[PDB]
């Protein structure tokens, strides 16, 4: 699971 | 609200409207130009040449030109001259072969300043700000034999040169596009053409190719 | 200006055929297009409604979903098209133009009519059903609605049409109060609210015939029963 | 042909100069008395209510 | 010659006892008798409809006699009838010529007229069985530009042209009745009367005239001007008109009394005047400038009462309905609005 | 941190400016779309951007709790992929507006009898289906995990140990969103300058202006976002490397959202007469 956030 | 025909009505008014806007995109598809002259400035043989008021139509490498030519007015100027105020361009006519002569009404005045005086009218007009001019000087086989026999001396008389063509077809030119006072708005081309040519069509098509690419180069804000 | 129609023959109870009207003589694009049908011996009724530019169709509640409308522009023709013909579907068929603007004249010409033989809603009510008269006098006709006709808009929307033997409806006054065009100033209508009346002040021998009475507020057309006018 | 341009011009004088006039007093109240007068049917002058005007929106 | 200079000399006495009879019956100014009465308020008026469909300058307009309906000319070629009340279009007809200066309807309401800048005036005529706007007559016997045409009757016209005279017409036959001469420059506008006995024209050398149409000779001649004449309209009564000059100035005179009553202008004002008209009580005058919005005038105290500012470009055509409820405006932002 | 409050201060400063600009370049430019083709290549760009405008506060908001969501579930899987697909549209538009004016100064004689206003509706519905073709990807692969630690819950991206089909998406968003436009970019201007300064009546200064400022512009704020992005996507979730990315992830993102605020600035300034055309309007 990765942390990616709100946008990318 | 409305009847059982009030929304006939309003139908007909969606049809005609709708034909209206297809017919008004269409009017767009077409090139204008204004012809302007002094009468026995070459007009006829140009009119001929690149084919109240007469209209003529002609289609050159898919470009469609609608030729306005107004010399049969004999009125006001400046009472029906404001009707061409977003035309393309004005094409331009000026007999060199005619600094001898003088005019019929008075033997003062010659048929060359009335030319210039017409020229600075049409070129300094509030209506015709950013307009391009597309100057013609016609008949210069003539203009070649009689300056031999006469001197350039009578038209002007503060020239000085060889007294050869190629000098007084340049003076000619120059004295004629020291007229403008603009010189950053407005752009003008000169061009020498005889009774028998072929390439005008050209000179005219390159001149609203011209115009058309920066009118567009305008539109976009990129000007 | 004529409309010319045909394709009516004899069906079985199951069957279908298709009629055709052709115009010749004005704009064909800009005038909306009817049908009426009037049963042998009885009275006449409508039947469909297409608009110019094809945008608008009405039918009617007693054929919807049974017949087509179509109509060609560039060939100037109005079809009609039928898929399963009852008992009742046995008549003659007229064509109808009409065209609506600010001061128009919609049902101006009727043309002629064609034969098809098998083997809430306003109603029109006029009592009166047969007249004798005298050439020289006055006539005085009346037509009875169930609902008041006046539009907020200032318009009343009436219509009155005469029927001679052997010939076809011709236009006499639109609007109640409004004069056709090809017609003697004798005519003249008048009414108000639910009760209209048509006069003729002077009779001549052109005058015999069947009169009738219809309604515009809203679809559908109905019409009433005709006033005979005997000699 | 200057002297019948001239004769036309002075017969056109004779023809103009001798009509009948009046004072400026007679022709002002004549306006001001049609304009009292016809001033009660102008909508544009008064405004009109909004109940009986056609352009209301 | 000498023949010459003495018939000059005989013009330039006539002109003098002209000039002394005119002074001679002045005897009062418009302004100390008017001075005494209730000016008018300040006028609003608010844009009831708008009218899109033009893609060019919109240069005549022209109401009709129910007060319902007007004509709209422009140069794209399309003349175009309206319907003010639901702002529908009832007719749109393209012209041969798109060089189109003026536009008349007939009071019957039979038929429309158009023309400019091709010396021909062109018939329309609306109510036809084949359900189009077909043409009907085409008047050529000019040699200058048509600058305005109104209709007498349903077979008589009268156009002004700028070949310096104008001309009475015949629609069934097609020839001149009648050929009014006397200018000297352009003729830009002609106003008929009510009662159609005679009527006014206005040209381009400063002066006005008045010509009675059945027998065929000027009778009147005003001058006071310094430039071109655009506008001219009758008073609603029949003895007075008003006219309106490129030197942004309008004056008001007489008929009876061929005298100048009075002058409109402001120092503020440097443009020049397209189109005047009157009320129906001939109370205000409302006049079209070129500096974008039109003002009106209270006809009496020559007093500014308030300005219709709601155009983008020049006005260049202002009618009002023979009803007086309404007022008609043109640009050439190729829009139509209607004031109340 | 630091790269926290200097992203919440751009975020701050283009939510404010771009939504007025935004809303005022689309309210001018709808009542224009009738008569100018010009209006409506422009018209979807403004909507683009002000929705993008629009979807700040959910980032904003975000930062400030430490990268919590409580929104749910759907709108996790919902949110994002539309957020991207405006972006994405932005971009296309701009690309497409480049075209447009290199085929205007170029061949002119064809685009005066055979061009009209359908033309320009068609390119942007392509441009939208090519940006939601885009970012179709982001709609599947989205989960959310929760903390049974100390509360907290988690967007993000799991791939089921599958790392050929992340690199392979990102490859594509990477060459189908940087690279292309750009040089489709690039190419029509500098020809456009090429053609426009070869005779002297186009000869102008002002073409030189925007086009520097447009390219310069995009290139300078676009390209930090995309190389940590495809420099994120290569590694693995384990690194300090990775952890150090993450550091500076919200700056990136604040610093190719400027570009939403620089766009339609050029608009205005660049523009004849716009006060006179938000006059009329």
Request: with cysteine; glycine share 16%; proline share 0%.
């Given at each position: 699971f990765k942390p990616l956030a709100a946008x990318r | 609200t409305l009847s059982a025909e009030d929304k006939a009505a309003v139908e007909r008014s969606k049809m005609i409207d709708r034909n209206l806007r297809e017919d008004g995109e269409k009017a767009a598809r077409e090139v204008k130009l204004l012809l302007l002259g002094a009468?026995?400035?070459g007009k006829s043989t140009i009119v001929k040449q690149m084919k109240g008021i007469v209209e003529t139509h002609f289609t050159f490498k898919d470009l469609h030109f609608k030729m306005f030519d107004?010399?049969?007015?004999?009125?006001?100027?400046?009472?029906?001259?404001?009707?061409?105020?977003?035309?393309t361009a004005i094409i331009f006519c000026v007999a060199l072969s005619d600094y001898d002569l003088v005019l019929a009404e008075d033997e003062e005045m010659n048929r060359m300043h009335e030319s210039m005086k017409l020229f600075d009218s049409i070129c300094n007009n509030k209506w015709f700000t950013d307009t391009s001019i597309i100057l013609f000087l016609n008949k210069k086989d003539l203009f070649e034999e009689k300056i031999k026999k006469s001197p350039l001396t009578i038209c002007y008389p503060e020239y000085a040169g060889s007294n050869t063509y190629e000098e007084a077809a340049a003076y000619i030119q120059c004295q004629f596009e020291d007229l403008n006072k603009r010189k950053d708005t407005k752009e003008i081309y000169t061009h020498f053409t005889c009774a028998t040519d072929t390439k005008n069509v050209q000179f005219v098509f390159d001149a609203v190719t011209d115009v058309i690419i920066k009118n567009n180069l305008k539109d976009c804000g990129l000007f | 200006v004529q409309l010319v129609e045909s394709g009516g023959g004899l069906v079985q109870p199951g069957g279908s055929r298709k009629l055709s009207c052709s115009a010749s003589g004005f704009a064909f694009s800009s005038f909306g297009m009817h049908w009426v049908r009037q049963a042998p011996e009885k009275g006449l009724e409508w039947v469909a409604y297409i608009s110019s530019g094809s945008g608008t169709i009405y039918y009617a509640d007693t054929v919807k979903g049974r017949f087509t409308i179509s109509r060609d522009d560039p060939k100037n023709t109005l079809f009609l098209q039928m898929t399963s013909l009852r008992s009742e579907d046995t008549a003659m068929y007229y064509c109808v133009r009409s065209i609506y603007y600010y001061g128009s004249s919609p049902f101006d010409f009727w043309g002629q009519g064609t034969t098809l033989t098998v083997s809430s809603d306003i109603v029109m009510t006029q009592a009166t059903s047969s007249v004798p008269v005298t050439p020289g006098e006055s006539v005085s006709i009346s037509c009875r609605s169930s609902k008041s006709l006046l539009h907020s808009n200032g318009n009343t929307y009436l219509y009155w049409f005469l029927q001679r033997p052997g010939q076809s409806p011709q236009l006499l006054i639109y609007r109640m109060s409004n004069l056709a065009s090809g017609v003697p100033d004798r005519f003249s209508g008048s009414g108000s609210g639910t009760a209209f009346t048509l006069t003729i002040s002077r009779l001549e021998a052109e005058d015999v015939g069947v009169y009738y009475c219809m309604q515009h507020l809203e679809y559908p057309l109905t019409f009433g029963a005709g006033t005979k006018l005997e000699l | 042909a200057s002297i019948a341009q001239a004769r036309k011009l002075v017969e056109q004088l004779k023809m103009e100069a001798n009509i009948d006039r009046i004072k400026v007093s007679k022709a002002a109240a004549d306006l001001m008395a049609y304009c009292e007068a016809h001033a009660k049917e102008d909508p544009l002058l008064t405004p009109v209510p909004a109940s009986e005007n056609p352009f209301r929106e | 010659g000498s023949e010459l200079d003495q018939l000059r000399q005989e013009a330039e006495q006539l002109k003098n006892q002209i000039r002394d009879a005119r002074k001679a019956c002045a005897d009062a100014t418009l302004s100390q008798i008017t001075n005494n009465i209730d000016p008018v308020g300040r006028i609003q008026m608010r844009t009831r409809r708008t009218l899109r469909g033009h893609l060019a300058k919109i240069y005549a307009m022209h109401w009709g006699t129910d007060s319902r309906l007007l004509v709209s000319a422009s140069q794209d070629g399309k003349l175009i009838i309206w319907d003010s009340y639901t702002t529908n279009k009832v007719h749109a007809i393209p012209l041969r010529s798109s060089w189109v200066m003026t536009c008349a309807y007939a009071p019957s309401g039979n038929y429309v007229a158009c023309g400019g800048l091709d010396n021909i005036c062109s018939i329309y005529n609306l109510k036809t069985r084949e359900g189009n706007v077909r043409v009907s007559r085409e008047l050529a016997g000019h040699t200058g530009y048509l600058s305005c045409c109104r209709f007498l009757d349903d077979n008589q016209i009268v156009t002004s042209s700028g070949d310096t005279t104008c001309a009475l017409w015949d629609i069934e036959t097609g020839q001149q009745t009648t050929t009014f001469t006397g200018h000297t420059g352009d003729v830009m506008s002609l106003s008929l009367a009510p009662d159609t006995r005679l009527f006014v024209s206005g040209a381009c050398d400063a002066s006005a005239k008045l010509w009675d149409v059945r027998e065929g000779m000027c009778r009147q001649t005003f001058t006071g001007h310094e430039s071109d004449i655009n506008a001219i309209c009758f008073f609603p009564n029949g003895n007075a008109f008003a006219t309106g000059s490129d030197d942004a100035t309008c004056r008001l005179f007489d008929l009876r009394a061929d005298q100048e009553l009075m002058t409109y202008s402001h120092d503020n004002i440097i443009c020049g005047i397209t189109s005047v008209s009157f009320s129906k009580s001939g109370r205000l005058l409302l006049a079209g400038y070129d500096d974008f919005n039109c003002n009106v005038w209270?006809?009496?105290?020559?007093d500014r009462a308030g300005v219709l500012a709601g155009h983008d470009n020049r006005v260049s055509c202002l009618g009002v309905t023979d009803d007086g409820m309404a007022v008609a405006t043109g640009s050439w932002d190729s829009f139509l609005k209607i004031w109340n | 941190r630091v790269p926290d409050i200097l992203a919440l201060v751009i975020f701050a400063v283009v939510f404010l400016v771009g939504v007025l600009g935004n809303a005022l370049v689309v309210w001018v430019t709808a009542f224009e779309a009738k008569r100018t083709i010009n209006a409506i290549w422009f018209l979807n760009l403004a909507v683009a951007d002000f929705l993008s405008c629009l979807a700040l506060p959910i980032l904003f908001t975000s930062i400030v709790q430490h990268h919590h969501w409580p929104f749910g579930g759907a709108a996790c899987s919902i949110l994002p992929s539309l957020i991207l697909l405006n972006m994405y549209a932005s971009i296309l538009l701009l690309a497409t507006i480049s075209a447009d004016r290199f085929l205007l100064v170029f061949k002119p004689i064809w685009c005066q009898n055979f061009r009209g206003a359908g033309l320009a509706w068609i390119a942007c519905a392509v441009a939208w289906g090519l940006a939601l073709l885009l970012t179709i990807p982001s709609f599947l692969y989205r989960v959310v995990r929760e903390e049974y630690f100390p509360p907290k819950v988690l967007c993000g991206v799991d791939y089921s140990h599958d790392k050929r089909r992340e690199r392979a998406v990102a490859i594509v968003r990477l060459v189908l969103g940087f690279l292309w436009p750009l040089l489709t970019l690039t190419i029509c201007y500098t020809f456009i300058l090429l053609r426009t300064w070869s005779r002297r009546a186009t000869r102008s200064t002002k073409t030189l202006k925007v086009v520097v400022a447009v390219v310069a512009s995009f290139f300078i704020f676009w390209l930090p976002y995309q190389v940590t992005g495809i420099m994120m996507s290569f590694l693995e979730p384990s690194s300090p490397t990775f952890l150090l990315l993450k550091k500076l992830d919200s700056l990136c993102v604040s610093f190719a959202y400027i570009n939403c605020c620089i766009n339609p600035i050029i608009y205005v300034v660049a523009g004849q007469g716009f006060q006179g055309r938000l006059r009329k309007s």
């Open positions: - | 009468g026995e400035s107004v010399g049969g007015q004999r009125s006001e100027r400046k009472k029906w001259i404001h009707c061409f105020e977003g035309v | - | - | 209270d006809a009496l105290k020559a | -």
